[PDB]
Design a protein around this ligand. Structure first.
Ligand SMILES: O=P(O)(O)CCCCCc1c(O)nc(O)nc1NC[C@H](O)[C@H](O)[C@H](O)CO
Ligand SMILES: O=P(O)(O)CCCCCc1c(O)nc(O)nc1NC[C@H](O)[C@H](O)[C@H](O)CO
Ligand SMILES: O=P(O)(O)CCCCCc1c(O)nc(O)nc1NC[C@H](O)[C@H](O)[C@H](O)CO
Ligand SMILES: O=P(O)(O)CCCCCc1c(O)nc(O)nc1NC[C@H](O)[C@H](O)[C@H](O)CO
Ligand SMILES: O=P(O)(O)CCCCCc1c(O)nc(O)nc1NC[C@H](O)[C@H](O)[C@H](O)CO
Lengths: 168, 168, 168, 168, 168
């Protein structure tokens, strides 16, 4: 038989992992809601509260190097991360700033995984409006969608447990 | 009427190769159809079912690192892959998320080949609509196109047999 | 006079850091206002006047290699930078030059951080019009925004203090 | 379609060089016409028929790794290439697949030159319509333009003779 | 109306440097005007006529590898370049070729600097029309703008003098 064909969606136990969340501070009310959702979902999957490390940077452009150095600091302290969730909220304005920051930041986070040698979850919102970002953090008045921060927390746990440096 | 996918240049015999399929879970019904098509075409070319290994990740952005680590795990187990097919279905929504994920994921999969030292087949659908994705997986009500997963399985066998690490 | 106003996130003491500002010279009135705002904000955070080093390049495309060699020069002199702020102003014209320079410069500055081994703040304005650029340097007739040079100065201090080479 | 460009700055003698042509098979009638024109132009510049090596891959996305491994096999066989011409034809469809494959393939072929340590000629057509592609291979009904494969053969000989690994 | 080509922020003594100019041959009347302007300005800054080295390639896509190998050739000859100005003229046509060549060539030239270990001036015009390209080479009927080749010559001298390999 084909190995893994039809294997059901499993539950991941995050009890032994350490997760870093590093967030930008622009659009702070949205950021905070995304972070809280990631935290709650990881705690629901077993991640200990003392094993969830928070760090901040000024803007989304600072996420890649901030994440690199956050990983470095945690390893040097003897509390290395197994996975990290950089979180930022970018909202289109009148210039092309949104596009150039979003593009360079997204590629940099993707390409950073090889350098920090761990999964880096994509927690950057790249919205055309603030209303879109509120909805994607589960805090729009209409509660039209759900908090994507929860999905990022779940992905952090799965990626660490199945593919982390210590997984095999 | 014209002329897309070309006829395979020859009948590739995939009997000695091992292929990994690693797929995201967004748009799961479409994903499953693409995966089945890839498996069916590879089996028709002689790849043994025991040498087809399936792995999964949450979303398309996790495909590049997941593929890197899936390759590592298979090699560490003494069952190295000769070729891998990362499969993901991205459908344009309201924000620029589709574009940023599609762009960084496509470039990362292309650039991953030198790192995993094997061919990585491009199995990402980057569609504007769900109907377009359905049609490209061969599951639209009208069956207007065909299952592109089959083409990806054929490409995996050809790339592994002609250019894989063990080909020469 | 420490009047304050922008986002919490701790108060960073930049008294021990050395910051380089390297700026392009096209759109010089805008550039000069941006630079002056960055200097003023860093001075308000304790960065000493003799530890703010200024260098210039002709255009924004020269920022990446200019910054690489400015970092080299400062280290060879025994006055290494802890963080650098490349500043340039790109304004859309009639051709696609704006887009090609903006895109390659932004990615190069982001990817330069690993090479110079320090944070590189994104001080590149990528505006569709001159008025947009003026507004973002706090010098438009309407004073419709604020000088973004100040934000860059603040980010330079924070990134150096929290994540610079000498921070831990 | 109004075409510029010049003839070498000389008549290059390609009698001592070995050229690889590696083509995708999507849009095969157009591909064949392009390949033929490159061959004819190279033969007219003195490249021996025994020193023109043809290889194929399924689609344009397979060109970069296909080229990398084709160079490797030729070198391993003691018949190393001095230059290679990857040829593919991409025609916009309904989704963004055309854009994502074109973008990642073009960058990958450009960046591959350092890795294969030889010139890699850009023989990808990135057309909006089939007509446009037919015209650029010299086979549209009206013969409006000319076969661009010829220009690619000419550029392969010039780059090999002037800048190939063995040129100096 | 004949006058000094001096500019107050361009006062650099180029007497000790060697500059390479490597140009594409597509749109040759415009190319020649740009090259001429760069030579004229560098001569006005003291660069000696025997220290300005010219090389050519077929199209703008060949500029990155042509420049890499031109640098190698000059160093092997014991006449190493201190800075190089790749010049090419791209004019939008009916397909996406203009965009794919422009984008990959611009990124490759920017990233080539670390590899050739010298400044690489951005001398590529990426115009929508021939008239725009003519104007930017100072040869439109109207003489609406000025020859941008002059600015590139000035930047080449400044970058070599201030940041070249032998500057410090
Ligand atoms: O086009 P406009 O009107 O100027 C709107 C700007 C949208 C992008 C805003 C923007 C945003 O929406 N979100 C985040 O996180 N940062 C942004 N800019 C700050 C940068 O990340 C870096 O901190 C700074 O550049 C120094 O490195
Ligand atoms: O613009 P909208 O309306 O919000 C629609 C979004 C379309 C893109 C959706 C999306 C999709 O269509 N397909 C897949 O596979 N992933 C997507 N996002 C999940 C990410 O891949 C990562 O898992 C997550 O970011 C953590 O790393
Ligand atoms: O499209 P148009 O009308 O020609 C307008 C041009 C807008 C971009 C202008 C432009 C601008 O607005 N700002 C800066 O900093 N540089 C620019 N061009 C100079 C380049 O950076 C390099 O110095 C030079 O290329 C040599 O390396
Ligand atoms: O947007 P639509 O309607 O689906 C049209 C698609 C146009 C692009 C077609 C396409 C085309 O026009 N030409 C080439 O060479 N390959 C294409 N796709 C195949 C890929 O290159 C890889 O073989 C496959 O991805 C596995 O790696
Ligand atoms: O879209 P259309 O109508 O076909 C117009 C084409 C505009 C781009 C033209 C084009 C142009 O305007 N200028 C330059 O320098 N090269 C071009 N194409 C040649 C390439 O640089 C490479 O030499 C060749 O690809 C082999 O490597």
């Amino acid at each position: 038989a084909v190995k893994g064909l039809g294997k059901p969606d499993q539950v991941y136990d995050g009890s032994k992992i350490r997760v870093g969340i590093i967030h930008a501070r622009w659009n702070r009310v949205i950021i905070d809601a995304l972070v809280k959702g990631a935290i709650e979902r990881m705690a629901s999957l077993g991640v200990e509260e003392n094993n969830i490390i928070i760090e901040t940077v000024p803007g989304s452009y600072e996420l890649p190097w901030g994440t690199k150095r956050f990983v470095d600091r945690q390893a040097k302290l003897g509390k290395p991360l197994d996975v990290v969730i950089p979180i930022g909220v970018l909202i289109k304005g009148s210039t092309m700033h949104f596009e150039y920051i979003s593009d360079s930041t997204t590629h940099a986070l993707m390409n950073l995984q090889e350098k920090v040698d761990m999964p880096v979850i994509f927690g950057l919102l790249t919205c055309m409006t603030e209303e879109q970002a509120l909805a994607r953090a589960g805090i729009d008045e209409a509660h039209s969608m759900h908090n994507h921060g929860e999905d990022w927390g779940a992905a952090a746990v799965e990626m660490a447990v199945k593919f982390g440096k210590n997984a095999f």
